[PDB]
Design a protein around this ligand. Structure first.
Ligand code: MG
Lengths: 211, 81
């Protein structure tokens, strides 16, 4: 049927929030709107920088943006120039001063967003959907995912009738709340429409929780 | 005494006494101004006016505490202009 968002159901249990700040009702909406604009701009500007996660915090009258990426050197540029320009424009978008930090994701093949981006890019760049998804699971299991599942959906290969197909290796318990299931999604805009790709990666359970 | 010569100190005047007896008988914290505090644990810190607690005879001045430089309210006696 219809399943709950894994990250959504697990938020506060074994998953952290992407945005972490306090604000009264007078400015909560404004903060959300600024967050949306900043994330949109950064995602588009760094589309080719393998950005995995944009954590926005709002210390006092400032905004700290942490970009989890698998390619820190591209984002940074020679001696910080690119970070500087990104910060200078994020400060414009937010209004308050801004600071940018870069966190490398050591093993991108275990990152759901990066896996989805790779598969989407391949599909747009004209590759066999079965080959692409099988290659990403194999790589994920090789790098050590306790489990992985990929679901491609919609007019695969230009077929007139859209179909859904999914591969799954290992174990991906989605009803276990203490399980660590990094889930993300991507859409491939191809000449015959939108192809949706969902990726779940199970990377062990958390007992102590630690939120 | 204070006078022209030490041999004969001089009085003040006729009208000077009257003026002294006359006196003996007889400021707004602009927003954005940078202030210092007058008393309390936060006494003599570099604060900056953030809002106007005017009709309270009070004040509120931003200050730089634990990175969360907090919206901090003071008495009107706590200004230093
Ligand atoms: Mg339901």
């Amino acid at each position: 049927g219809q399943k709950v968002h894994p990250n959504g159901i697990r938020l506060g249990i074994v998953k952290p929030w992407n945005s972490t700040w306090f604000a009264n009702t007078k400015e909560f909406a404004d903060n959300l709107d600024s967050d949306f604009k900043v994330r949109q701009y950064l995602t588009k500007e760094l589309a080719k920088a393998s950005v995995s996660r944009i954590v926005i915090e709002r210390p006092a009258k400032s905004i700290r943006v942490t970009i989890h990426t698998a390619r820190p050197g591209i984002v940074i540029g020679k001696k910080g120039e690119d970070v500087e320009k990104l910060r200078k424009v994020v400060a414009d978008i937010a209004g308050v001063p801004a600071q940018i930090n870069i966190a490398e994701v050591r093993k991108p093949e275990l990152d759901a967003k990066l896996v989805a981006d790779s598969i989407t890019s391949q599909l747009e760049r004209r590759v066999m959907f079965r080959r692409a998804m099988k290659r990403t699971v194999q790589n994920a299991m090789r790098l050590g995912a306790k489990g992985i599942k990929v679901e491609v959906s919609g007019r695969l290969g230009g077929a007139e009738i859209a179909r859904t197909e999914w591969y799954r290796e290992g174990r991906v318990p989605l009803h276990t709340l203490r399980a660590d299931i990094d889930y993300n999604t991507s859409e491939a805009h191809t000449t015959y429409g939108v192809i949706g790709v969902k990726v779940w990666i199970f990377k062990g359970e958390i007992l102590g929780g630690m939120a | 005494f204070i006078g022209g010569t030490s041999d004969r100190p001089a009085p003040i005047s006729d009208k000077e006494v009257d003026a002294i007896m006359n006196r003996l008988q007889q400021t707004l914290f602009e927003p954005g101004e940078m202030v210092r505090v007058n008393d309390g644990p936060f006494a003599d810190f570099n604060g900056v006016v953030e809002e106007v607690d005017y009709e309270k005879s009070r004040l509120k001045v931003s200050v730089s505490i634990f990175g969360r430089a907090t919206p901090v309210e003071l008495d009107f006696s706590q200004v230093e202009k």
